[PDB]
Structure formats: structure tokens, C-alpha cells
Design a protein around this ligand. Structure first.
Ligand SMILES: Cc1cccc(-c2ccc([C@@H]3C[C@@H]3c3cc(=O)n(C)c(N)n3)cc2)c1
Length: 358
């Protein structure tokens, strides 16, 4: 899948985007790759910050679904007008598909002043599609209308950033060692189960249910590694102890600071087999973001969010066909001379089911 290697671009902190075309003739747009949502939505009006937008009036293949959508989220929101049209991906598979498209008509704190993307591609499942599961997501529509295998993978590499979205398969050149797989728990977000956490090899020893309170997901849409309040509290306390060789606001992402004094962080994830897990390990070069750095770990109320902090350490395979997600050491991650990002197993971990939440 070399046709698709390096098909992702971005600016530090503004997400990864992939080139797409909408309509006939085809209108090129940059679209942010978001495994944390399920809507395909593009700017359709001349917002001041946009470089380009979907002009439905120029598209012969556009169809109106005569319905609107309102997507509040943490801060702020987008609204748009539902329709369908022919979507293609220049550096993806050689296909065209009729997909649902929210034409974004009003917006608040959604588009970024400075960025180079004007739409979002939600890669998660129908269950969290807006306004409801009846709105078939792009990838569901892709697989239905073609022989493209039900699978995609991302290697996020990280002003300018880059990466690869391999649609329909796996590019082995993008990783080293073996892939290890965690089960997708429920097909809405990409939910998984964290079974253990270690800072510099030292278990946090928390009820593992607290690691998935009330959710843990894989989110290319997030920059941070985001932990639930309790966990993060313990997480940071332990990171602080490890790093005894900084002001409290910093740890809270209220201020900035300006490698080896820092502890590697390990997540054990539920394995494919009963009482079996594996672990992914990241370096400070990953949770310390650019000499001023931001502490890229942060408390959360929505659960654990495995964002670019995690994802930029690994080649991540979203194997929808088998309801599972694989992690491999990324052949691009930034590592120094001593520590390296790692994916290791198997381990024996009892009672992994209990780490889940209901
Ligand atoms: C990394 C980055 C930078 C700038 C903007 C975003 C971004 C902005 C909006 C969204 C749309 C609302 C849905 C959404 C909201 C949201 O809060 N998250 C974490 C995700 N993954 N998706 C998704 C991602 C993401």
C-alpha cells in the first residue's frame, strides 16, 4: 500500500488530515482523521478560517437528505445539512462511494484559525453517529460498496507532522516486531480495556476498573493521553516521585517547562485470550510535547483517551472485521539511544473482564 504511505499531513496540535474529494466534478478538501467520532462533515460555507469548502451547487451527484444536524461537544459545536455525494480519496484505494455528508453550516470553536483542514472524517461506529445510528458512517459505506477490506491502520509520526492511513490493510514496512491485539469491547467508539498501568515498571495497583471509568478509547482526534481523575491523580503522583531529580500548574497543563529523569509509562491492555494481556510502553519524548514543553497527560471525565501521545508511539491497526485493534512498535516513533517505545507480551493477568465498566 505504498500508494497510501505518507498520505497524512498536519500541524503540531491541529490533528492529522487526509486529502479527499467530494462531488462531481471532484472538489478537493483536507479532512481530519478522527477515530473518536463517526460523522463525515465538511465546511460548506465561506468561514473566514477555511481555505476551501464544499460547494453543493457545483455538484451534479449531490442529494439532499432534507434533514439537519446539531453536534454540541465539549466546546463548542457544529451544525450542518445532511446530504449524500460521491466521495473519493486520491491517495487511498481506487474507488468512489456514495457517502452521507453533513454540510457544515454553522460552527463554534470547531475550525482552527491557522489550520489547513476544512472537514472531519469520523471513523468510529454508527452507535455514536449524529443524529442517530441510522446515519451510515463513511467507512461502513466504503466496505458495503466495494471489496475494500473492513480494516484501516494508522501510523502517526508527528511545525509539520505526517503519517499514513492505510485503508483496507496493513503495510508491514510501517512497523517492527509483532502486532498485538486488544479486543474492541463495544462497537461505538473504539473502546478497549486497560488492565494495568505502570510508571517505570511500578504498578499503580488501582482497581483496574478505575482505568476504564467510564470508558477507554483510541482517539486520533485527541492530542493528549487523558486519564480519569482518580488514575491521573495517582499517575502523576508516581510520575512526580520518579522524577524527583516543577510547579503544580505544570502537571495540570496550566503552565510550561523549559529526558532520563522521566519514567516510561506502560499500559497493559486486554489480550486476545482469556487471562492474557500485553503492554504498550511510551517514553517522555511522547508525553512531553514541544525549549518549552507541555505536559501531555491530563485528567478526564469521559474516560481514558489514548490520543497521539500513545498513538505516535505505535502502528495501530483498527481491525473492524475481527472486532479488535492491534499495536506494534512504529517504525517512525521518536526514541533516544537508551529507551524505546515497546510492545510486549504475553502476560498473565487474571480477572481482566472485571476491569470493564457498566
Ligand atoms: C487534535 C484536534 C485538533 C483540533 C480539533 C480536533 C477536533 C475537533 C472537533 C472534532 C469533532 C467534534 C468531534 C470530536 C470532538 C472531540 O472532543 N473529540 C475528542 C473527538 N475525537 N472528536 C474532532 C476533533 C482535534
Amino acid at each position: 500500500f505504498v500508494e497510501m504511505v505518507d498520505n497524512l499531513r498536519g500541524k503540531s496540535g491541529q490533528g492529522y488530515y487526509v486529502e479527499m474529494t467530494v462531488g462531481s466534478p471532484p472538489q478537493t478538501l483536507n479532512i481530519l482523521v478522527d477515530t473518536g467520532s463517526s460523522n463525515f462533515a465538511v465546511g460548506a460555507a465561506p468561514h473566514p478560517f477555511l481555505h476551501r469548502y464544499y460547494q453543493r451547487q457545483l455538484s451534479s451527484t449531490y442529494r439532499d437528505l432534507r434533514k439537519g444536524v446539531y453536534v454540541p461537544y465539549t466546546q463548542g459545536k457544529w451544525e450542518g445539512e445532511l446530504g449524500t455525494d460521491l466521495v473519493s480519496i486520491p491517495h487511498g484505494p481506487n474507488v468512489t462511494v456514495r457517502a452521507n455528508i453533513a454540510a457544515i453550516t454553522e460552527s463554534d470553536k470547531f475550525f482552527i484559525n491557522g489550520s489547513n483542514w476544512e472537514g472531519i472524517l469520523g471513523l468510529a461506529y454508527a452507535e455514536i453517529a449524529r443524529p442517530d445510528d441510522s446515519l451510515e458512517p463513511f467507512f461502513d459505506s466504503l466496505v458495503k460498496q466495494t471489496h475494500v477490506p473492513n480494516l484501516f491502520s494508522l501510523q502517526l509520526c508527528g511545525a509539520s507532522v505526517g503519517g499514513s492511513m492505510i485503508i483496507g490493510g496493513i503495510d508491514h514496512s510501517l512497523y517492527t516486531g509483532s502486532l498485538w491485539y486488544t479486543p474492541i469491547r463495544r462497537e461505538w467508539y473504539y473502546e478497549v480495556i486497560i488492565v494495568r498501568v505502570e510508571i517505570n515498571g511500578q504498578d499503580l495497583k488501582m482497581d483496574c476498573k478505575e482505568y476504564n471509568y467510564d470508558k477507554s478509547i483510541v482517539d486520533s482526534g485527541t492530542t493528549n493521553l487523558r486519564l480519569p481523575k482518580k488514575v491521573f491523580e495517582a499517575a502523576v503522583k508516581s510520575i512526580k516521585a520518579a522524577s524527583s531529580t516543577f510547579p503544580d500548574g505544570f502537571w495540570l497543563g496550566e503552565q510550561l517547562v523549559c529526558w532520563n529523569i522521566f519514567p516510561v509509562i506502560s499500559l497493559y491492555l486486554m489480550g486476545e485470550v482469556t487471562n492474557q494481556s500485553f503492554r504498550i510502553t511510551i517514553l517522555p519524548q511522547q508525553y512531553l510535547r514541544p525549549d518549552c514543553y507541555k505536559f501531555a497527560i491530563s485528567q478526564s471525565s469521559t474516560g481514558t483517551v489514548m490520543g497521539a501521545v500513545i498513538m505516535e508511539g505505535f502502528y495501530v491497526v483498527f481491525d473492524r472485521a475481527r472486532k479488535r485493534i492491534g499495536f506494534a512498535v512504529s517504525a517512525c516513533h521518536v526514541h533516544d539511544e537508551f529507551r524505546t517505545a515497546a510492545v510486549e507480551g504475553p502476560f498473565v493477568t487474571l480477572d481482566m473482564e472485571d476491569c470493564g465498566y457498566n
